[model samples]
Target: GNYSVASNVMVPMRDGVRLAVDLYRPDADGPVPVLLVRNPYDKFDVFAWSTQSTNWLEFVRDGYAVVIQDTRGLFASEGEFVPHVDDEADAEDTLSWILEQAWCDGNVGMFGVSYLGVTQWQAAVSGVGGLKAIAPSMASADLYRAPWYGPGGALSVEALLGWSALIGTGLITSRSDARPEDAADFVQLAAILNDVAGAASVTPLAEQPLLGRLIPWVIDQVVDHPDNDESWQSISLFERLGGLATPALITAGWYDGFVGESLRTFVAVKDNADARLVVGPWSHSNLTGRNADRKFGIAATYPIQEATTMHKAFFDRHLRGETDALAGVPKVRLFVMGIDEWRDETDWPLPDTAYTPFYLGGSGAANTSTGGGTLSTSISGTESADTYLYDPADPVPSLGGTLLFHNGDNGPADQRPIHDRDDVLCYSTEVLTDPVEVTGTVSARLFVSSSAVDTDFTAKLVDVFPDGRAIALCDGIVRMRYRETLVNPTLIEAGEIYEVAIDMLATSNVFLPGHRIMVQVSSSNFPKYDRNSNTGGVIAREQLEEMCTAVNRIHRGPEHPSHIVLPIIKR
Candidate 1:
């Protein structure tokens, strides 16, 4: 079957703004179901060159029309670009246009990852009639969590700023009518974005003049609205999931930045709609089995998994009336780490999960890996606490685990370098004689006291091999001021002990025999998250002079009982 390319067809919206779409329609006699992809990135290149195994030509060959479109105000589209804010209306308007097209069979399915995935969610909730199914991969419905704002009101500095730099650079370079001045501005913007780490390090974040001028949304998001206020709520796709009945095929990576939100989205929609989820050991844009310095073997490759094949099957089952397309597929499928095999389950956080608390017990000098920190099933009767001075000037570096758009390593990498730091308190269980599988939500509960008015508490779950390699799985941070709630922040009194929980997000890994389960405690995970200045003041606006070093303590005993909670799954 052959196809014809219809390039740059302008579809008009209610407000008369035209969105550009490149249509690939099969030269079939009858109308065909359409697979629509809406992207903020250039549609012609990014999706074409992605690591995904999906081939648009194959979809066209299978008697489907593949349409790739630029969202409003990006490349080749008319109107202002406002990220997710404008997507719902644009998607609704576009789908209506697709329904009217001669090639469109009145059945449509959407697909993509990251921002592209966000567009799918936006369209699903738009109440559009033609959208029958969607595949929102590696993206979240809640921008307030994970990729934008972290667990406890800390800004995702590297992810947010790096994305802003990309958008700002693309916005300028995609101009059809380029001027000499625009070229000069693009150069300046490129120079700033080329070093995203340096750009993020700029204090008084509003003072990053180029991004402040070019892309004001970054400053607006970080500076004006630090909390989950009405602005954040208005754009939250998670909040709008009610009454969404479109069958969805969701895909995520265990180490992807949006894994938590993606899983939660699956849970949110599964009860109301046909939702099937697939999570692998890959990262955001990686599907080659190698993530950072770790490898999950060829079985984890996109081709081996038949990623797009499952997608086509899903679409066929939902929209094309092929009842047997997904006959044997389970409600949930995951790539289990440590064992490095894909497993099918009935739901997220399987029914047989047992919530286990690994108690933290250590001497007073539990500052580094060499310190006498130990993790066990039982709590210690003796009074013990780990104390370390957290310096805002020299915060702990982010080594690995679910990071995006940074200069450092990502996914499961050796965390032994960080264990040498005196600021990080390490608590490790003895080498396991029996394998322990943790396949659900992971968190840390800590009773802490700090000398400063406010600070941050970070928790990382690691797996230590027999060869002394400590690999980070997942981690989380809580800004002390926002520990109680992200909406309303209250500063803590110095020297007062407070109980806080760090949401380490989620992971599916087994601690095999001879591997040790370790939990790390610290005040910061820099670059990945913004550093707390310990002043109980506004973040991103505090100067270096305002930063104060303070002694922080993690108390462990029967009364304090600092521990990490793992969702241990029994196979």
Candidate 2:
């Protein structure tokens, strides 16, 4: 064997639950630095480590002790798995054990992906002993927001259910899909697997017969929690990030499910901890590979550590305090799409960003790409409006964007498929004379009147090519009852127009010359969101729900002006 191993150490927690740890020490090592990874997924295997996690063999071969363990429950561990709260206490205890180990030099670094990364996040937040640095990819500040529930509070169907199913089904022995659903479409046959989401949700979600059996506890979460308490303050890293002491290597995918959450963690910790952010134009699962539907040339496929510094080099610098090991790297590095290359920035949102507004002006015929819909400067004189029927049964299908459901459609896919629908109100700008870089959140203000008191509205930001390929950037939704706030539910009067501001998720994309920026407005983005019954009743836990064909009307004019604001960056 290349290394000496200690299998099943059973590290004891404060509550007397002994979590199992597999400590791998180098053949030549006499008390070397430690690389700790505590997770519920499984003990580090070649399949998992090779596909999704850090190359542990690389760390071990480089003369560091590799420590891996199972969290509270799931695998060969102890006690009940409570997810958010379990990691903090279990992680603290594990690090405590590492400090006392004979082979450990008290210099330790923790790293992992998805929930494993989350454990590192929890471990880092607890400020455990001997924790020198951490590398967490696709981690969340709050367990619910941006990662699980939404960019705008809407529940992600594919991501939520599939993960719950994966956890509940117990795939440790048969880890077919090695990682949890990150940002990448690692699993093919999503059109098949998405049926689980679509089929379950076709039963009005929240009350799926399959999930009611597969992961019933998840149903409880889906049904309850009207407001955002940041998935509870103890679980939220954003609240814990202020004045953080640890140095971190945070990684994200531009089109990954947790990109927003990763960015949130970075922005807060940038001022406090010695943190570095590297974002690639990738899916959650594939970091160095191409995305599901498109390739951004050879430059997009470089590994994050290699793009700046090697992983071992980074580990040596942060854990051992070697001078300038990460000297060549920038503080923040992000992948800019459209032009398809990496760009280094001093901060998030890129400096000198102009919040430009593109006013919506149309003659009530803004149905598709060529429907007389104009998005440009100056409000229109005619106070015209567009109306379309929203049937929950036949809700608009999710085309492209970051969807959790294994729908076989994930990142930056072509948007021309859904442009034929009349319900999807498309508004676009003329061919740009020069390249316009949109590097922030795209927001829309709509003066809307609906036939029902409670419904939902969805908005999409797209980049339309001169060859007629509409590629999606980001999207958002607003449940009409929860319009004011998630907690304060307000049902509006039918036929009375109310102005609402919808914030699409953030992205960094350069609309090249001759490109057109388009905004698609609709009512439902189906299975991605539980179809709003429009009956004003509780969406979850309600069977025999009445599905009404509500006509949604969008107003556009000088007085009732509706528009989208883009974060235009100066070249």
Candidate 3:
């Protein structure tokens, strides 16, 4: 089927804001199902969608109308952009507009990655009549739980700032009322994003000059509202999942910062929607077989078919009424790292998953990988408590695992360099006698105390190769202030022991025979999360003078028994 595009079609929202879209219609016998992609990034930018492995033209060739729109206030659109505050209303209006179109067959499905993907969830939860199904890749349904902010109330500095800078740069250049002085501002935004590490490293997140000036919404929405509340729930798709009847194809990467939330989104929508999930050994931006320093083999990528082909198959079943298009497809498809194989599963967190705890033990000097820290099923009555001084000025560097901006360190990179730092506590299990397959969400339950009013603790899951490569699989952080609950934050008294569970996110990795399983415990993961000032003041507004060093301790043995919980699958 041949396709023709109607470029820059103005679609008016309820508030009279006109949004621009590029509608591609196929030469079909009658009207066809529309595949709508509403994105803040420019709709005509081919590389933006291509990097996520989506080719909307393929949908046009498959007899579907593809409508790609520039969201309000960004690119070729009108009105203000408040960082998803207007998405739900705007998406519903867009869907209404699409349904009235002569080319649309009263059925629409949405697809895209990141912010584009987020728009799909917004539309799905909008209760629109014409929206049939959607495929959201590497996007989170909830902001406070993961990706944008950690579950424990710590802001994802690099992810939010980097993405906002990128969006703001695009907004300034594409606006119809572009200012003459915008060129200088554009370069500053580009420079901030180009050196994202330095930009994110700026103290007092509220005063991060460039980003705070360009994208003040990030400061208001994320920085101002550090704790979860009713306001946060308004934008959360998780809250509306029970009523979501729209069938969805949710794709995520184990190495993506939103993997935990993406997986949770599928589960939340299970009863109401025919949701399917596919997780690969990739990151937020890198979907290639090769991720960071290692290759997960060809099987990890699109071995059976292209990513878009898989999406089209799902849409065919739900939108085009081709029931047989996905007849034998499994509800869950996971890419297992280490051996690098794809497996079709009945559901996520595999039904036969065994929650096993590997206790953490050390000889009190577990400051580095060379220290005597061991992981075992047995817990002795007594063991030394490892201690490390956490200097906020010189926190642990983020190596790999789930990250947003790609800076040569996004996926499963080796943690040998980071593990060697004195601030990290490395615990490793002896060489495995048999293969251990861990296939679910991971966490670290630690009994610890800090010498400051508030601090942060981080945990990393690593698969140690025989040649001494500490490859990170997934990691998480817990801001001490939100250790109890995200809604009500409490500042802990100095030297008071507190049991905090760090959500290490989710992953599927096999510890092959002879390889070791290691967990790195530390106080920080650098720019991935904002540094805790350790003064218990407002995190985003704390000054540099208030920042202080704190002595952190991780207790072990029968009394404290700090350990990491791994979901082991018996093969």
Candidate 4:
């Protein structure tokens, strides 16, 4: 089989702007389906090697035309790149252009990871006609729900800042003919934005006019629209999922920022047509390698043979009209943690499951390292509340799970370092006598009050091993002002108790016998999730002086009943 690679081919956009693209096709003149990948990361280089395996080469060798294009304003492209915001319109326009190409066989499919993955969903929602299938990896449906902010309405500072810096550096290099000295200043400015105290000041520097304005405009929009309002709703894939006629193969990693979004996308569109999900134990990068499964706490790391094979089989069946390629396959495929094995489920959340509410109960006596916060289902007193002083200046530091760093090293396992802090309140059930399998969404209902006008409540689910290691499973947060609606923010009275729900994302795990199920209550997750200033000031511009000390409480009783809801599957 002979292969031909074409580089720097200009693809025209809807607005008459042309984007640079690279095309790889088999040498034979036979008509072949196209696999399109639109990415902000430069497609001219070998960056894909680090992000994913060279699977596209295999596709090209197998008589499929592969097209990789740089998003508008990125790399050799013409217009200003606006990150995820432009994907909807751009993807539609790009697909139309690909379909008209001589090599395309009137059928198109999209594939990529991270930002590339996000574009696929955006394109599908735009009602692109020729697209038959898509494989969106480590992407989100609603930007506000997963990577940008948590249920607590807290910003993902590190993830956002790191992304901005990475893209900003590339943009700066593409425009400014800077010497080494100037490059140092650019790197320094990016580093300053990573600090919460300095973000407000550094944001203005990103507004350099001659550098093309879309990046700054997009950042401003995200900062202004902190909540999931109409701004986020308009581009949300969840709202347009009903129109998703194209078959989809969604993929994600447990530690990726878009894990929750991936799950939501899968569950929402699975029943639509030919939708499937594959969740592995990898991060933002390396979907197939020895390290992919290892970082997820699996016993052994296996090559991604099944994932790639499934992708090829799906494309063959959907685009090529082949029948035997996708027969007898389950719709939902998940990589279960701890067990380190792949399992198939008929539905997304695993039907025939019960919604179990676990109440948190303990005496005020369980306050120190010596006294453990005992948890039980038995209801107790009406006025029991645990209050803790949360200081924004000393916000809790992020340990692991969905954090962005310059180097990909956060730390090894063991969440006790964060849970032991005084600001974090821990409640744990006695060692489980029977194994409990939990899958799907997790949420916490809390009857809480704060001494300040606004605050946040964070809940973390942990699995306490018999050897005393607390492993974090899932976590969530809720800003008091947006407790009712994310679109509207109404400040709370200084000392008024309010009912709040914290969404802790989704997970599929089994807590074995002798392992204790624990929940940690806190106000902040630091750089991973931003701290609530409590002064109700503008997001990304709030001053440190406005950060107030708040007394937080978690109530569980007849009048103020608060509990954790788990989607439990009975084996």
Candidate 5:
């Protein structure tokens, strides 16, 4: 079941750029629907190395030609390679060229994960004219929101640093031909990316050669950009909807960094077109192996998942109009944790979902697990507040949440290890008498104050098993300056109570009857997030000399009550 391959085929774009393209055909190639994969990663190396286990054989054997191409200004291609913004126009041009070719049947479907996945959405946003469908895994419609940075304005250190140190220094720096010796150091750069022990502690980050001079600036623009800027409309699909009118099959991992973005894209496009989603308990990197803590089960493993089969089914129905394959399927398929299995629902949020608020209650000693921190529906007494000192030099370490780049525990790690920190405020419900199913966007509204003019606050929701292992489900962060708005940024007045909402992390997990729901409130989770200097100066470019300690306070009384809003589903 081998196929013939063509190398170094050039496709011209409207901007007069020639992109490197490669084609694979089962035979001499009659007209067939094309499974196109446009990527910034070297198509040759990816196809050669990745396809050893799965390749064009799967798609071409099923009467589809496989087309893989290097993005503009990447590898063998020509153009300026700006990681995030190069794909939209190039993808549309590629699809248009495929339709004009004799080998293509005017039907195209795109598929990939991560960067390749983001390209799929960008192409869809380009108006799927010749494109029939897309299968984007771990992709995001909002570029600034997840994976890169949280809505709370905390920079994802290891994620960005590792990305720049790997993809930036390797592929974007130069070609192997131009710098063969430097190219060989690509593997060496891998070790450097893992060398981020205390990267967030670096002062004046703009001057650091950590992510290279260019890569850090690239990140600076996004992390420092306005949240909903019309200026970014040229490339971003953040608030744009109906652009991906074509049928779409979005894939995501519950523990993956892009899960929030995946859900964001699905909820945006679901009503506009034929949209479906499948989220498993897997992480961004570990598809078949274990999570941050342990394996859900064999069913959650990727080997048994048959992802290609699923993508093929999507392409078959949308591109070839094979009606019988997915005629009566549910719109959303999710892997529910704790239950550790897959479930189907007619829509996102499981339909008819109930939203419940678990109020934060405690005496002044809610700084540790043994502290009087508690979670309940009824208020205990008058206004009470818990305060802790947050020092930039000794920020609370990240345990686990939506993270990558081999940072401190990426998914479902035991949070009890760090829960005892004085800076981390813990509140948990008394052992649940009944199983509480939580499935949807988890958020927290806090009435907070700090000694510094600006600072940060982090919230983590955990499922506490009877054995005392507290596994984090999701978490969020909020920077004080961006509290009111990102466009008109202003620091909070010192010692003044301000309300802020931080809920970027989302999940679907069930607290078994014996398990307890816990929420941890803190000021820092580094290097998962950049260390806030608490100096009230511009954060993305802060100086070490400006570092200050802030006494952060969390209010949990009826007057200025702080609470977490949980999407509780009745089973």
Candidate 6:
């Protein structure tokens, strides 16, 4: 298998700085379609490099030109690097340059995972004439509502801090004559320091020029935008989804930080005839063979070979005009957990699905350790209200399900450890004799009255195993003041009951026979996510005193039936 490989060619940007790009082309001298990947992470790293080693080599051997470029201010590239800020303009310019290259066939496709995936979307939205297809795997469209910062107003402290240190260190080190390999190692060391020191405590280390200046900038951004505001909106690709014209192949992992964003991208582009989605039981590092379970249940595992085959098939079809290879792919495809099976649907929110509402009912016993809250279809106005005191000092710690960690191991899925605590309220369904498939978004409608003018509500959807371990599937939270609308926060009338709806991220899972579906209600998921300061003050300056006690009520009467809506797909 003879192949032609070239290293370190500088591609000139509009601002006149050259970005370092490594090109791999087929042995043939004839022009070939180009696959471009732009990433802030080192292009030479074995794991951070583009998907599937064999597939990438084969693509180049089969007359396709594969190009990997270091993002601006990284590695061989020159310019001040700002994550996600320059993606749109940079992608457009890069694609135009590739199209003009002597070796290109004028057809370009973009490929990458995570940050690279975000860049793919940005390029597609730019409407570059050369981009014909894209495969963005394990990525996000909106940074605000996605895992980086939750929709419920919780900050993703760990992820932000980790990324800040890694990227910031890389940019600062690149300014010197430091070897790329050595700079990467130094960045990892900085990330280690960032983790040991809490986000707030790591500011000085991040500001150190030797460690890299970009780290502090990232920390500042995270601190400044505690809520989903214009700053986040500037980098979000959701607004550009409507303008995408190229065929796309979107991939995501069940346990990855960008799962919600992956689903949103699919839903946003499902109407296009050229869109396809593939979901796997893996995490961010699983694609590179790091974790054992890949953050999926035992039944959800699949061979990485399958992912490679599918990726090749998609690119071969769209970029090479091999139509028959891509036949039978539906508008939406998901890897259903529990069952560990791949299912195809004509559309998301799957057709013929029912939106069933499960009301919360219990005596004040909802907070009991034995899971006293009952989940049923029968409406009862007489159910007693359950109350608990939420202390921000002891906010709930994040377990495996939704959050991503640097350690690579997924957190424990069982909610029992947290459920037993007084701050958490649990509602469970009786063991089911038949299996139930839940696909689509999960939302909680809560009618709550808080003693304080401002507060927060957090909800988690759990799958109780036959062995009694309650695994978390998805969760959501809402600040009381922003319950009515996120744009404006209004103080709650003291002791007044107001209805608030929380939209949890979407999920695709099947609850097996004998399994129980549970929902845990609480006020916080801390550290992994930022605590909600009950004072409703400006996020950066709010003091702990604003964190006050609030009473939350879930109403199920005719006027206010607080319930959970499940998108149930009948099999």
Which one is best on lDDT? 1
TM-score-based ranking, best first?
A: 1, 3, 5, 2, 4, 6
Error of 6 at 447 (Å): 0.6
In terms of lDDT, the poorest run of 10 residues in model 6 is 199-208
lDDT of 4 by residue, 1-571 (tens): 7887778888777678888888787887567888877766678776544336434566777888887777777678888655566777777777777777677789888777677677777777766677788887777777777677766667766666566556667656776466655556585755554563455233332243422242564456766677677777766667778666677877777666777777777667666587786666655643342431135533334345556677788889988999799888887777777666777877776778888888777666444334557666666565577767888778877665665552233322477655556776777787678787887777878788877787777777777778877666667777777878777678778777777777777777888888988777777766676666677777466556655677777666667877889888886
In model 5, pairs of residues that clash are none
Give one digit per residue, the lDDT tens place, for model 6 in 105-212.
Answer: 777776766666777777777766666777887787777776566666556766765655555555455554665566556655665654532543332222434334
lDDT of 1 by residue, 524-551 (tens): 8878888788887776677888678888
Candidate 2 lDDT over residue span 237-299, tens digit each: 667677777778888776677777788777777776677887777666555545555667776
Write the residue-wise lDDT of candidate 3 on 42-95 in tens digits: 677777466555665666776777777777777667777777788888777777
User: lDDT of each structure?
Assistant: 0.77, 0.71, 0.75, 0.69, 0.72, 0.68
Candidate 6: C-alpha lDDT: 0.68
Off by over 4 Å in 4: 47-54, 175-181, 187-215, 229-234, 285-302, 381-383, 406-412
Candidate 3 wrongly placed segments (more than 4 Å) = 175-180, 302-305, 362-364, 406-410
Cα RMSD, each candidate: 2.1, 4.7, 2.4, 3.5, 2.9, 3.9
State how far residue 319 of model 3 sits from its true place (Å).
2.9
| Candidate 5 positional error at 457, Å | 1.2
Index of the highest-TM-score prediction: 1
The collision pairs in model 3 are: none
**TM-score per candidate, chains pooled:** 0.95, 0.90, 0.93, 0.89, 0.91, 0.88
Q: Measured by TM-score, how close is model 6 to the native structure?
A: 0.88
lDDT for model 3, on a 0 to 1 scale?
A: 0.75
Tens-digit lDDT string for candidate 5 (30-93): 6877887776667767753353123436778667788888776667988776666666677777
Q: By how many angstroms RMSD does model 3 differ from the true structure? A: 2.4
Query: Which is the better candidate, 2 or 3, if ranked by lDDT?
Result: 3
| Residue 171 miss distance in model 5 (angstroms) | 4.2
